[PDB]
Amino acid sequence: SSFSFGGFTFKRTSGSSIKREEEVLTGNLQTLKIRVHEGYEEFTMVGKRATAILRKATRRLVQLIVSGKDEQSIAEAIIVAMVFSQEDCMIKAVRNPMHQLLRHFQKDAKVLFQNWGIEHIDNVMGMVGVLPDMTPSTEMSMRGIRVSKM
Numbered sequence: 845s846s847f848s849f850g851g852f853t854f855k856r857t858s859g860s861s862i863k864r865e866e867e868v869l870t871g872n873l874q875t876l877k878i879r880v881h882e883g884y885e886e887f888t889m890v891g892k893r894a895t896a897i898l899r900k901a902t903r904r905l906v907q908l909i910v911s912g913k914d915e916q917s918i919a920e921a922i923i924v925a926m927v928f929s930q931e932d933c934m935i936k937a938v939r940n941p942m943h944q945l946l947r948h949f950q951k952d953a954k955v956l957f958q959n960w961g962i963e964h965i966d967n968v969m970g971m972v973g974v975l976p977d978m979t980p981s982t983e984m985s986m987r988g989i990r991v992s993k994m
């Protein structure tokens with residue numbers, strides 16, 4: 845049971861979710877009603893120029909491993925995963941509604957990427973950390989984001 849979002853074909857590989865219509869507050873203190881998916885799920889994200897493995901819980905991205913043609917393709921996949929995750933820091937970075945959030949971050953993901961948070965990494969090799977400005981790092985990455993070689 846496959847579906848499409850932001851140019852990516854998502855396929856659930858594990859888990860399940862139930863939906864709950866919920867009201868969330870953006871960084872401008874605007875109320876949006878979104879359909880929240882509750883549960884732990886794992887997906888493949890297949891696009892024309894990037895592919896990824898996403899693991900998420902309710903409104904929380906656990907891990908995203910991205911592969912792609914270049915920085916732009918990879919960033920494009922990261923934006924979709926972050927919006928898809930429904931995380932509160934993604935909603936707070938704003939300063940069908942899922943498509944509206946996506947269209948907003950696609951224009952400029954600078955605030956999304958800053959506000960997301962950064963973490964120290966272990967060096968699983970063949971996977972690199974990526975900084976908010978898309979520079980690769982072997983020490984630090986945006987929370988749960990890893991870049992894999994094509």
Ligand SMILES: CC(C)(C)[C@@H](CC(=O)O)Nc1nc(-c2c[nH]c3ncc(F)cc23)ncc1F
Nearest residue numbers: 847848849861879881885927928929930942943
């Ligand atoms: C991708 C998008 C078009 C916005 C959503 C809208 C919806 O909730 O129906 N569509 C689908 N999401 C998920 C789905 C499954 N798990 C999810 N977790 C978070 C999330 F935002 C969506 C999902 N699964 C199947 C879908 F068709």
